[PDB]
């Protein structure tokens, strides 16, 4: 049985970075060369493992996290990184073992006049824990005055929309990102490469 990497990478619709989508993968085989020899990926970086060795390793579970961010922010999808995305939306631990794959999605996720459907968290009290997914629309208290859940002065809605127009620079353009995580537990290994 082949692993359903198709439905993740070629998903017709991608999630916002604050509410990122996780696909749990197990009990299948995959040819990771179809990824790292793809001509459409603009970013392809792996941590803790060599992508050419992936075809000879077995893993307890694989996690495919997918979302959309700005081009200037793809560099934030890395261990030990600081920034609005890394701190409020999607954090990777220092011992992260996996790959980060990004590609330009201007032709899809940007509309004339603007595609304002992709969001990101701009305010938060504390930094995220690794692989945390916070989706609260709780009003952020930026003053010494209780907000009591009412938007106002020093009371901000925590989520900001992305302005994706096709005329923005490649930086401010939208990028679809997939983060593969390779989990090796002390149980039988069930995801592998071919033979």
């Amino acid at each position: 049985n082949l692993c359903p990497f198709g439905e993740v990478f070629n998903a017709t619709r991608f999630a916002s970075v604050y509410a990122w989508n996780r696909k749990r993968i197990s009990n299948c085989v995959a040819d990771y060369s179809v990824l790292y020899n793809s001509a459409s990926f603009s970013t392809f970086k792996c941590y803790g493992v060599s992508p050419t060795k992936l075809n000879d390793l077995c893993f307890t579970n694989v996690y495919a996290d997918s979302f959309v961010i700005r081009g200037d922010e793809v560099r934030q999808i890395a261990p030990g990184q600081t920034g609005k995305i890394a701190d409020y939306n999607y954090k990777l631990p220092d011992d992260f073992t996996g790959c980060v794959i990004a590609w330009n999605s201007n032709n899809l996720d940007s509309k004339v006049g603007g595609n304002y459907n992709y969001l990101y968290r701009l305010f938060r009290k504390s930094n995220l824990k690794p692989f945390e997914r916070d989706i609260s629309t709780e009003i952020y208290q930026a003053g010494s005055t209780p907000c009591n859940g009412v938007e106002g002065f020093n009371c901000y809605f925590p989520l900001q929309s992305y302005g994706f127009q096709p005329t923005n620079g490649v930086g401010y353009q939208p990028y679809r990102v997939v983060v593969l995580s390779f989990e090796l537990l002390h149980a039988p290994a069930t995801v592998c490469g071919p033979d």
């Epitope: 803790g48 060599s50 060795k53």
Partner: antibody, heavy 126, light 111 residues
Framework: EVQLVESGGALVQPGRSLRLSCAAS????????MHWVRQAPGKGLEWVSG????????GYADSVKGRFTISRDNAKNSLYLQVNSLRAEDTALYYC???????????????????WGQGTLVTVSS | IVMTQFPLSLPVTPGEPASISCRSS???????????LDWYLQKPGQSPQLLIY???NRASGVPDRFSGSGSGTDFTLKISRVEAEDVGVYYC????????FGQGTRLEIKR
Amino acid sequence: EVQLVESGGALVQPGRSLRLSCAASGFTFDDYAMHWVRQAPGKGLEWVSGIDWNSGSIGYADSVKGRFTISRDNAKNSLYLQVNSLRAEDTALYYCVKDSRAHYDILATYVGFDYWGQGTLVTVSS
Amino acid sequence: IVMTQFPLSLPVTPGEPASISCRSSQSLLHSNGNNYLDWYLQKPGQSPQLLIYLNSNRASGVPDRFSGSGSGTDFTLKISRVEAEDVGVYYCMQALQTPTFGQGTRLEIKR
């Protein structure tokens, strides 16, 4: 500006060793693979060795396997090439060569060898 | 993989186009449709620098006069208007496997 400054090339007797070093600046060193490409005087270009962004994968040319050893210190934005058991055909300029990919042996994200150092000259003579 | 360049030295009058050949032993066409061949220009007294990557793409700062073409085991670099600065040796390289280079082509300016 991207700047790859090589050093360590010297006159060395045959059979001895040398430690080539390459100090990098002007780009995120942690993000790219690194290569050593050499050129004999008046001759063509020869790939020597390459290393991933995190030393995860390493390659060597057949003429240098077992003798040369590539490494990198990502904290010091530096690349190294240990040349051992030296022979006359190792006499060449050794170019530090920046890769566009994080990994030297994958085809994705390839946009050519972005920048080349000016090289350091290694002469093997008695 | 073995790269071979036919014109080892190309004398060309200024303003007149130039053309360089590159044969290879194996096909550099890949499943993803790209031809993994590059062009590198080594100007006098300098190390080589990237000119063309992926057969038909210019590196940063490369004028519109430089173009690349080919597919499989046969490629060609072309210049529309040769200039005096274009002096140097042009090198083939394949990126499908570990990098192999061609013996260079010296570009002479027929003055």
